[PDB]
Amino acid sequence: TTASSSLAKD
Amino acid sequence: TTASSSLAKD
Amino acid sequence: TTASSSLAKD
Amino acid sequence: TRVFKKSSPNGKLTVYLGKRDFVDHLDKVDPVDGVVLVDPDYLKDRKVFVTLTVAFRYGREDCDVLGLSFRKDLFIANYQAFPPTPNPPRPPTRLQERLLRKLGQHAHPFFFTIPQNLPSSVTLQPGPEDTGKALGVDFEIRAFVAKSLEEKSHKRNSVRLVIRKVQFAPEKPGPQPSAETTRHFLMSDRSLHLEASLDKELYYHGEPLNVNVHVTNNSTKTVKKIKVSVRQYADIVLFSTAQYKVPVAQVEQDDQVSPSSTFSKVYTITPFLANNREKRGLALDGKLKHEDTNLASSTIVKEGANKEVLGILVSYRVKVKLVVSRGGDVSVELPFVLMHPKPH
Amino acid sequence: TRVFKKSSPNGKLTVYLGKRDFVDHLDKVDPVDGVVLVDPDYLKDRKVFVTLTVAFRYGREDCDVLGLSFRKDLFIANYQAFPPTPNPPRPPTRLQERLLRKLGQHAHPFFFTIPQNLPSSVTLQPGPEDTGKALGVDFEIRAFVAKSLEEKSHKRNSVRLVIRKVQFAPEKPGPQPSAETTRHFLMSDRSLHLEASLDKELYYHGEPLNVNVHVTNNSTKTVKKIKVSVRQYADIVLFSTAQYKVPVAQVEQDDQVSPSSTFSKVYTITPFLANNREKRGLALDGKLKHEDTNLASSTIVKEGANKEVLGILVSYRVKVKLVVSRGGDVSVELPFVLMHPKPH
Amino acid sequence: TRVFKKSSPNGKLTVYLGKRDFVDHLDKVDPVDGVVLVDPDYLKDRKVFVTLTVAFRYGREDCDVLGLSFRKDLFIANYQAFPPTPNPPRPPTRLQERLLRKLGQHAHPFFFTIPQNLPSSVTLQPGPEDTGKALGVDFEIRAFVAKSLEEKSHKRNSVRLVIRKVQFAPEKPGPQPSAETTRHFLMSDRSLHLEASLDKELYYHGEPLNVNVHVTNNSTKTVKKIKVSVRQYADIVLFSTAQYKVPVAQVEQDDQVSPSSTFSKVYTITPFLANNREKRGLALDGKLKHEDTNLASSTIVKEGANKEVLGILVSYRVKVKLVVSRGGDVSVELPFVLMHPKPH
DSSP, rough: OOEOOOOOOO | OOOOOOOOOO | OOOOOOOOOO | OOEEEEOOOOSSSSEEOOOEEEEEEESOOOOOEEEEOOOOHHHSOEEEEEEEEOOOOOSSSSSSSBBOOOOEEEEEEEEESSSOOOSSSSSSSHHHHHHHHHHHHSSEEEEEOOOSOOOEEEEEEEOOOSSSSSOOBOOOEEEESSSSSOOOOOTOEEEEEOEEEEOOSSSSSSOOOOOEEEEOOOOOOOSEEEEESSSSSSOTOOOOEEEEEEEEEEEESEEEEEEEEEEEEEEESSSSSSEEEEEEEEEEEOBBSSEEEEEEEEEEEEOOSSOOOOTTOOOEEEOSSSSOOOOOOOEEEEEHHHHHHHHEEEEEEEEEEEESSOOOOOOEEEOOOOOOOOOO | OEEEEEEEESSEEEEESSSEEEBBBBSOOOEEEEEEOGGGGGSSSSSEEEEEEHHHOSSSSSSSSBBBOOOOEEEEEEEESSSOOOSSSSSSHHHHHHHHHHOSSSSEEEEEEEOOOOOOOOOEEESSSSOOOOOOOOEEEEEEESHHHHHHTOTTOOOOEEEEEEEEOOOOOOOOOOOEEEEOOOOOOOEEEEEEEOSSSSSOOOOOOOEEEEEOOOOSOOOOEEEEEEEEEEEEESSEEEOEEEEEEEEEEEOOOSSEEEEHHHHHEEOTTOSSSSSSEEEEEESSSSSOBBOOOOOOOOOOOOOOSSEEEEEEEEEEEEEEEEEEEEEEEEEEEEOOOOOO | OOOOEETTTTSSSEEEESSEEEBBBBSOOOOOEEEEEEEEHHHSEEEEEEEEEEEEOOOOOSSOOSOOOOOEEEEEEEEEESSSOSSSSOOOOOHHHHHHHHSSSSSEEEEEOOOSSSSEEEOOOOOOSOOSOOOOBBOOEEEESSSSSTSOOTTTOEEEEEEEEOOOSSSSSOOEEEEEEEOSSSSSSEEEEEEEEOSOSOOOOOOEEEEEEEEESSSOOOOEEEEEEEEEEEEESSSSSEEEEEEEEEEEEOOOOOSEEEEEEEEEEEOEEEEOOSOOOOOOOOSSOOOOOOOOOOOOOOOOOOOOOSSEEEEEEEEEEEEETTSSSSSEEEOOOOOOOOOO
16 A cells, blocks of 8 residues: 655755 | 629639 | 368378 | 638638639549738738648537547648748639739738549538537638747637538449349259349439349249348548448338249339438538538549548449348349539 | 655565655656665566556556456656666656665665656546546556566566646736627627626636626627536547537526617636536546546646647636527637646 | 368359468467469459458448448458469478369469467457447458459459467466465454465366365454456457456355354356356357357467567456455455367
């Protein structure tokens, strides 16, 4: 399914 | 609309 | 019509 | 004589055509020659073009709310009317010269040639079940003024006019159309021989056709009924060969041909539209706007067979069906043309 | 922020995509950028590829037992995700670099450029009479791992993800949309002059439209009814020009314009989907899976007219029809756009 | 043995064809070879040609009054039988030599090579609602005598004969077809694991199939019903990919799988035509004239995937659907072939 993860702010 | 005019005889 | 003939044995 | 005319809604642009109908002689078609009237102060920066587009148009153009035309463009040609181009092709014509003398300096001539490998004006009959007009190959002349060829269309600029391309009968009659059929049986040496012959190979609309049919029933089976009908075949090509055939006029007689006997007769059959107002898929000759017409004029093919399949092709055939008792039904088929004579 | 993700059923292949909605600035479109996650030993000799296919898909994909899509492919591109290729085009992007930092070595960058001559996400409304989803241009990103491009598709290998391409309103308003009509009669010098003007040329969905209509009936005929409606035109191009025009919102008033009199008024009309749930052929903006939306967003064309017709094109128009007694019916038509504002 | 024959209606032209069925070995198809009998003085100026045209024919040929075939020509070849051409390709063959010995000097050899990238004889089943025959790719050999290739067709000249191209099962069985599915819940740690396995990957028509299905319902939901069906997929390609899927045989059992339980069973399902006489869109193997047959034989693709998509492609699949209480329905799909064994 379509979902999201994390990503950090650079 | 579609109509006619004159034309001459040469 | 579709039919058949003879054919030989060589 | 007179000259037909059409003007732009703005009233600043007007186009004159020498004729509304054009005819082909099977080797050269009469060129489409016209002139356009325009005042340069209206445009002062633009250019004038005229377009002869032949389309496989469907439906109508009176803003009908339905799935509109498959707008396949069969052949398009372009010509820059203004600013003036080189003199060809080749001079201004006598009619164009006369219109220039009548009007003066604000007229511009345009010339066109119709390639011999193009269809004839045909229109399918709209069925009562559907709505609006129906499909059919048609010609159109559109004159528009703009800076570029691909510049967006404008109603005040473009002027739309409809022309027709129809054929006329050659004066040389063709060979006598006739056919024969000898039908044997599964094992018995008795057979069934029939003959069909025609008055001519060319006929005019409304003119009755007298088919000469003869039967030689030197057998024991019984002939129940004789069916006589005329079939129409409409070779339609857009990118794939297709053929919508449909009968138009059928005549029947409860005549019994006895075994070991011969029978001949002459029957009268007439192709006419009055009794087939509803049959969808019937082919009618090209209309001007919506006016009625006769059945689709048979389109004779040129001597050099090439392809010529770039539109709607129509042909007529007559079949006589013999209802023989206990199977063995056999029919005879024969071609003929049907279209107008040469006017004056 | 966040990043949308999709993973293969096997769980060894996963693709991360930076955004789900892509927008164009009328000169260049925001590039398609993402990363793909995969553990090397799963393939150990295969290669990884990603595809952006735009198709004229019909029907649905939930294994419906019916004549499925006419799957004409409009535009397709390929890129070797793994093994690594030359750095272009041109570097890994800021989002690409951020995903590489987050994940590490098993991420692979892939890049794509959407040509400016491509359609916008549009979907026709499925009619209740038929079943399942209906046709409509759509985008799709498919990442698969295999030894060859033509190697057979595998469900465990290929991963499917859907994106949309939508347009946003330019900040510069256009010219005032207005029109006029002066209708004379067959012979009489009396005429009928009417005026139509609009508030703006750009509007937002749900926002009412106030049409300014004025009539100068300095004639003798009677105006029976005034019809006001907004029409939708949907240019469909697969290999032939066609358009399925259909009204969406109509408003009527039993107002009588007397002869030798003038009449003007302001009418309020709103295009909305709530009252047209059943009309087949209505155009809706691209859906994600099956969720509802507004009406199809009007697609503005580029300044360079080129052709730009490789899909579904949608436009809006408003027509006001004047019912004049015993013939002489005349209507006025006018264009306008209708689509979302610029978000933040 | 014997040799099939067909003769022109006139009786002056007769063609002898070595075989009516042709088979391919996945690398070379048996060449089409035949001889033609003709008496020279009948033509005395013309030339003899034979044509193998493969068409996407629709409808029938018994002079039916309806929209006839979309007659797309898939692949057409030509060969000048008379006057004699160079010896290739390459000799007159053993059957050709034997026919020449039997007849003498009035026979003329012609040769043909069927490219490996061509479809197999398939015919869609005509629906009772419509009339006449239905569409389907088919082969045809037409021998005609004329001065030029483009010279008009004549019934007395042209002779029409129908051939079929069918495949036979390779002797090497493939891998065991099997599948699995583990379906968890939205949040709870309980899951649903099911197994499906098959007897073989190749089967003969009428031979029952025993699907080995096992369910591990270590979950909280209850299974209401189990649906077992076999699906047929017909990849149609004329100029755009199409796929008309339709089930052929379905079997159901009102078995309930309780939560926290395991359940396995074997089911007997048979693809047969007797119960699907009316379903339009079913695919049948190519007919000779109108005679019945089995279901469409599964067409195996060659090892080199290329495209091979120039006609009608057919494949079979079996799906088992588990009806789980209050949502969570999951199904398993699996491929297999079904077509004739190697005769002798």
